[PDB]
Amino acid sequence: KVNRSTALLKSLSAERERWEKTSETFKNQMSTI
């Protein structure tokens, strides 16, 4: 379904930005150990 694909793409973009933020905070934690 097209709606399923669009929702999946939006959720995937959200997860991508979430994991970019998670990698940034992991780098910050590495800087402060």
What's the rounded Cα separation, in Å, for the pair 24 and 32?
Answer: 13
What is the chain's alpha carbon radius of gyration, rounded to the nearest angstrom? 14
CA–CA distances in Å: residue 24 to residues 14, 27, 29, 33: 15, 5, 9, 15
Length of the chain: 33
The single-letter DSSP state of residue 18 is H
